[PDB]
PDB file of C-alpha atoms in Angstrom:
ATOM      1  CA  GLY A   1      85.370  97.045 -47.165  1.00  0.00           C
ATOM      2  CA  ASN A   2      84.239  95.668 -50.574  1.00  0.00           C
ATOM      3  CA  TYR A   3      83.886  92.038 -51.468  1.00  0.00           C
ATOM      4  CA  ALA A   4      86.495  90.578 -53.189  1.00  0.00           C
ATOM      5  CA  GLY A   5      84.528  89.379 -56.079  1.00  0.00           C
ATOM      6  CA  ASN A   6      81.744  91.801 -57.096  1.00  0.00           C
ATOM      7  CA  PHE A   7      80.759  89.676 -60.660  1.00  0.00           C
ATOM      8  CA  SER A   8      77.384  91.326 -60.516  1.00  0.00           C
ATOM      9  CA  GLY A   9      78.654  94.909 -60.802  1.00  0.00           C
ATOM     10  CA  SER A  10      79.978  93.971 -64.458  1.00  0.00           C
ATOM     11  CA  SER A  11      77.384  91.405 -65.343  1.00  0.00           C
ATOM     12  CA  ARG A  12      74.097  90.803 -66.905  1.00  0.00           C
ATOM     13  CA  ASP A  13      71.370  87.857 -67.676  1.00  0.00           C
ATOM     14  CA  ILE A  14      72.903  85.741 -64.527  1.00  0.00           C
ATOM     15  CA  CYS A  15      71.050  82.573 -64.426  1.00  0.00           C
ATOM     16  CA  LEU A  16      71.319  78.980 -63.009  1.00  0.00           C
ATOM     17  CA  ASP A  17      71.967  75.775 -64.814  1.00  0.00           C
ATOM     18  CA  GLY A  18      72.142  73.062 -61.938  1.00  0.00           C
ATOM     19  CA  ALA A  19      75.029  74.379 -60.269  1.00  0.00           C
ATOM     20  CA  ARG A  20      76.740  76.021 -62.597  1.00  0.00           C
ATOM     21  CA  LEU A  21      76.666  80.056 -62.540  1.00  0.00           C
ATOM     22  CA  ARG A  22      76.210  81.564 -66.177  1.00  0.00           C
ATOM     23  CA  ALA A  23      76.114  85.182 -67.377  1.00  0.00           C
ATOM     24  CA  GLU A  24      76.841  87.782 -69.652  1.00  0.00           C
ATOM     25  CA  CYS A  25      80.297  89.333 -68.239  1.00  0.00           C
ATOM     26  CA  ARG A  26      81.292  92.776 -69.478  1.00  0.00           C
ATOM     27  CA  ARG A  27      85.187  93.010 -70.964  1.00  0.00           C
ATOM     28  CA  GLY A  28      87.693  95.612 -70.911  1.00  0.00           C
ATOM     29  CA  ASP A  29      87.244  96.120 -74.694  1.00  0.00           C
ATOM     30  CA  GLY A  30      83.587  97.214 -73.520  1.00  0.00           C
ATOM     31  CA  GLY A  31      82.018  94.132 -75.333  1.00  0.00           C
ATOM     32  CA  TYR A  32      80.526  90.901 -73.447  1.00  0.00           C
ATOM     33  CA  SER A  33      81.281  87.281 -73.482  1.00  0.00           C
ATOM     34  CA  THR A  34      78.981  84.635 -72.170  1.00  0.00           C
ATOM     35  CA  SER A  35      81.022  82.829 -69.249  1.00  0.00           C
ATOM     36  CA  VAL A  36      80.320  79.615 -66.810  1.00  0.00           C
ATOM     37  CA  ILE A  37      81.597  78.761 -63.595  1.00  0.00           C
ATOM     38  CA  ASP A  38      80.878  75.819 -61.537  1.00  0.00           C
ATOM     39  CA  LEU A  39      79.632  76.643 -57.840  1.00  0.00           C
ATOM     40  CA  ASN A  40      79.759  72.938 -56.862  1.00  0.00           C
ATOM     41  CA  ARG A  41      83.822  73.436 -56.832  1.00  0.00           C
ATOM     42  CA  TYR A  42      83.455  76.361 -54.619  1.00  0.00           C
ATOM     43  CA  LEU A  43      80.614  75.944 -52.409  1.00  0.00           C
ATOM     44  CA  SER A  44      79.674  73.213 -49.699  1.00  0.00           C
ATOM     45  CA  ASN A  45      76.655  72.320 -47.554  1.00  0.00           C
ATOM     46  CA  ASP A  46      78.053  72.526 -43.761  1.00  0.00           C
ATOM     47  CA  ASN A  47      75.421  70.516 -41.957  1.00  0.00           C
ATOM     48  CA  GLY A  48      72.468  72.627 -43.590  1.00  0.00           C
ATOM     49  CA  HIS A  49      74.426  75.854 -44.078  1.00  0.00           C
ATOM     50  CA  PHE A  50      76.248  77.116 -47.315  1.00  0.00           C
ATOM     51  CA  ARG A  51      79.867  77.806 -47.052  1.00  0.00           C
ATOM     52  CA  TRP A  52      82.905  78.809 -48.997  1.00  0.00           C
ATOM     53  CA  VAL A  53      85.463  75.931 -48.904  1.00  0.00           C
ATOM     54  CA  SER A  54      86.506  74.948 -52.311  1.00  0.00           C
ATOM     55  CA  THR A  55      87.283  71.280 -53.482  1.00  0.00           C
ATOM     56  CA  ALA A  56      90.682  70.269 -52.184  1.00  0.00           C
ATOM     57  CA  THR A  57      92.348  67.255 -50.550  1.00  0.00           C
ATOM     58  CA  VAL A  58      93.618  67.067 -47.111  1.00  0.00           C
ATOM     59  CA  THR A  59      96.276  65.147 -44.944  1.00  0.00           C
ATOM     60  CA  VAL A  60      95.079  63.777 -41.762  1.00  0.00           C
ATOM     61  CA  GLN A  61      97.480  64.657 -38.790  1.00  0.00           C
ATOM     62  CA  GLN A  62      98.646  63.055 -35.742  1.00  0.00           C
ATOM     63  CA  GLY A  63      95.934  62.968 -33.152  1.00  0.00           C
ATOM     64  CA  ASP A  64      93.260  63.988 -35.590  1.00  0.00           C
ATOM     65  CA  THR A  65      89.640  62.916 -35.351  1.00  0.00           C
ATOM     66  CA  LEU A  66      87.176  63.282 -38.306  1.00  0.00           C
ATOM     67  CA  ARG A  67      85.493  66.085 -36.270  1.00  0.00           C
ATOM     68  CA  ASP A  68      89.178  67.955 -35.949  1.00  0.00           C
ATOM     69  CA  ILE A  69      89.547  67.757 -39.717  1.00  0.00           C
ATOM     70  CA  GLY A  70      85.940  69.579 -40.062  1.00  0.00           C
ATOM     71  CA  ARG A  71      86.811  71.996 -37.617  1.00  0.00           C
ATOM     72  CA  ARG A  72      90.085  72.651 -39.380  1.00  0.00           C
ATOM     73  CA  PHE A  73      88.506  73.198 -42.631  1.00  0.00           C
ATOM     74  CA  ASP A  74      85.137  74.222 -42.073  1.00  0.00           C
ATOM     75  CA  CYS A  75      83.456  71.423 -43.143  1.00  0.00           C
ATOM     76  CA  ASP A  76      80.580  69.078 -41.672  1.00  0.00           C
ATOM     77  CA  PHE A  77      82.452  65.771 -40.509  1.00  0.00           C
ATOM     78  CA  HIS A  78      79.027  63.729 -42.047  1.00  0.00           C
ATOM     79  CA  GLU A  79      80.029  65.112 -45.252  1.00  0.00           C
ATOM     80  CA  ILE A  80      83.559  64.379 -45.215  1.00  0.00           C
ATOM     81  CA  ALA A  81      82.413  60.729 -44.093  1.00  0.00           C
ATOM     82  CA  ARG A  82      79.962  60.300 -47.198  1.00  0.00           C
ATOM     83  CA  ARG A  83      82.396  61.950 -49.636  1.00  0.00           C
ATOM     84  CA  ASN A  84      85.299  59.531 -48.804  1.00  0.00           C
ATOM     85  CA  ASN A  85      83.110  56.498 -48.081  1.00  0.00           C
ATOM     86  CA  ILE A  86      83.527  56.066 -44.398  1.00  0.00           C
ATOM     87  CA  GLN A  87      81.100  56.618 -41.429  1.00  0.00           C
ATOM     88  CA  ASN A  88      80.655  59.187 -39.305  1.00  0.00           C
ATOM     89  CA  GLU A  89      81.997  57.694 -35.926  1.00  0.00           C
ATOM     90  CA  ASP A  90      84.905  56.109 -37.930  1.00  0.00           C
ATOM     91  CA  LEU A  91      88.384  56.543 -36.620  1.00  0.00           C
ATOM     92  CA  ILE A  92      91.066  58.425 -39.323  1.00  0.00           C
ATOM     93  CA  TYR A  93      94.743  57.788 -39.673  1.00  0.00           C
ATOM     94  CA  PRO A  94      97.650  60.131 -39.845  1.00  0.00           C
ATOM     95  CA  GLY A  95      98.859  60.328 -43.391  1.00  0.00           C
ATOM     96  CA  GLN A  96      95.469  59.261 -44.714  1.00  0.00           C
ATOM     97  CA  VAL A  97      94.257  61.729 -47.470  1.00  0.00           C
ATOM     98  CA  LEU A  98      90.900  63.154 -47.332  1.00  0.00           C
ATOM     99  CA  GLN A  99      88.672  64.865 -49.994  1.00  0.00           C
ATOM    100  CA  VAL A 100      86.610  68.147 -48.484  1.00  0.00           C
ATOM    101  CA  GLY A 101      84.623  70.919 -49.759  1.00  0.00           C
ATOM    102  CA  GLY A 102      82.508  71.945 -52.470  1.00  0.00           C
ATOM    103  CA  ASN A 103      79.726  69.526 -53.502  1.00  0.00           C
ATOM    104  CA  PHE A 104      76.854  71.249 -51.883  1.00  0.00           C
ATOM    105  CA  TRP A 105      74.818  70.140 -55.028  1.00  0.00           C
ATOM    106  CA  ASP A 106      74.782  66.826 -53.553  1.00  0.00           C
ATOM    107  CA  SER A 107      72.667  67.272 -50.688  1.00  0.00           C
ATOM    108  CA  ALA A 108      70.479  70.269 -52.039  1.00  0.00           C
ATOM    109  CA  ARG A 109      67.148  70.981 -53.291  1.00  0.00           C
ATOM    110  CA  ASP A 110      64.920  74.023 -54.602  1.00  0.00           C
ATOM    111  CA  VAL A 111      68.264  75.650 -55.874  1.00  0.00           C
ATOM    112  CA  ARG A 112      67.749  78.930 -57.200  1.00  0.00           C
ATOM    113  CA  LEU A 113      69.077  82.564 -57.689  1.00  0.00           C
ATOM    114  CA  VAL A 114      67.431  85.483 -56.036  1.00  0.00           C
ATOM    115  CA  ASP A 115      67.796  89.349 -55.911  1.00  0.00           C
ATOM    116  CA  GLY A 116      69.086  89.972 -59.505  1.00  0.00           C
ATOM    117  CA  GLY A 117      71.155  86.615 -59.734  1.00  0.00           C
ATOM    118  CA  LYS A 118      73.245  88.242 -56.454  1.00  0.00           C
ATOM    119  CA  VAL A 119      71.954  85.789 -53.709  1.00  0.00           C
ATOM    120  CA  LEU A 120      72.125  81.688 -54.420  1.00  0.00           C
ATOM    121  CA  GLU A 121      69.152  80.037 -52.313  1.00  0.00           C
ATOM    122  CA  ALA A 122      68.285  76.464 -51.664  1.00  0.00           C
ATOM    123  CA  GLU A 123      67.387  73.721 -49.011  1.00  0.00           C
ATOM    124  CA  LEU A 124      70.029  71.960 -47.937  1.00  0.00           C
ATOM    125  CA  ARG A 125      70.079  68.675 -45.989  1.00  0.00           C
ATOM    126  CA  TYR A 126      71.355  68.592 -42.506  1.00  0.00           C
ATOM    127  CA  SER A 127      71.748  65.627 -40.127  1.00  0.00           C
ATOM    128  CA  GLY A 128      67.918  65.536 -38.939  1.00  0.00           C
ATOM    129  CA  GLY A 129      66.252  67.287 -41.935  1.00  0.00           C
ATOM    130  CA  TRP A 130      66.206  70.318 -44.354  1.00  0.00           C
ATOM    131  CA  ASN A 131      67.261  74.089 -43.844  1.00  0.00           C
ATOM    132  CA  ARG A 132      66.754  76.866 -46.213  1.00  0.00           C
ATOM    133  CA  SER A 133      70.263  78.671 -46.593  1.00  0.00           C
ATOM    134  CA  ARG A 134      71.469  81.816 -48.634  1.00  0.00           C
ATOM    135  CA  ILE A 135      74.890  82.990 -49.589  1.00  0.00           C
ATOM    136  CA  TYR A 136      76.007  86.295 -51.247  1.00  0.00           C
ATOM    137  CA  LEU A 137      77.719  84.902 -54.352  1.00  0.00           C
ATOM    138  CA  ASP A 138      79.674  88.399 -55.130  1.00  0.00           C
ATOM    139  CA  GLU A 139      81.862  87.474 -51.889  1.00  0.00           C
ATOM    140  CA  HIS A 140      83.703  85.192 -54.054  1.00  0.00           C
ATOM    141  CA  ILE A 141      82.686  85.145 -57.616  1.00  0.00           C
ATOM    142  CA  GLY A 142      84.383  87.917 -59.767  1.00  0.00           C
ATOM    143  CA  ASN A 143      84.509  88.817 -63.452  1.00  0.00           C
ATOM    144  CA  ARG A 144      88.005  89.114 -64.792  1.00  0.00           C
ATOM    145  CA  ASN A 145      87.595  90.761 -68.448  1.00  0.00           C
ATOM    146  CA  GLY A 146      84.637  88.343 -69.476  1.00  0.00           C
ATOM    147  CA  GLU A 147      85.625  85.458 -67.416  1.00  0.00           C
ATOM    148  CA  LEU A 148      83.499  84.493 -64.122  1.00  0.00           C
ATOM    149  CA  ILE A 149      86.525  83.582 -61.610  1.00  0.00           C
ATOM    150  CA  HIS A 150      86.749  82.658 -57.853  1.00  0.00           C
ATOM    151  CA  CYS A 151      88.582  84.953 -55.677  1.00  0.00           C
TER     152      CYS A 151
END
C-alpha cells in the first residue's frame, strides 16, 4: 500500500540545497517548521542508479569478495572500493570494516527536484559514462511533527 515516508503530503516550499532537502513541514499544532534532511546520508549511486542505502559500516565475512559485499547491501563494488580507498579488483579480508551507502552526491551532476519536490532527478556517473536517474523521495522521507525524517 502507501509509501512509508509521504513527507510531501504535509510539506510545502520543498527545495534542494546541494544534497540537503529543505521544506516547510506541517506540525501537529497546525503551524509550520522549516526543516532539513541530508539526502546524502540515505541515497547512493548504484552504478548509475539511485538507491536507498543509508551510510553504514559493514564487516567482511569469510569467503567474501567485494562484489559479494555489493550484492549483499545493494551497492556498487566500484563505489565501495573508491569510498574505502582501495581498488576495484582488490581482495578483501574477513573482519575488515567497510563503509557503504549514501554519498550519491560525490558522483552526481545536474541534481534537481521535479513534480513539486516529490522526485529527485540527476545524472549519475557509472563505469562508462553518465546515466539520468530519478527517485520518489516520499518512499523514505517523512514529516514527523514538523521534522523531516528517514523512515
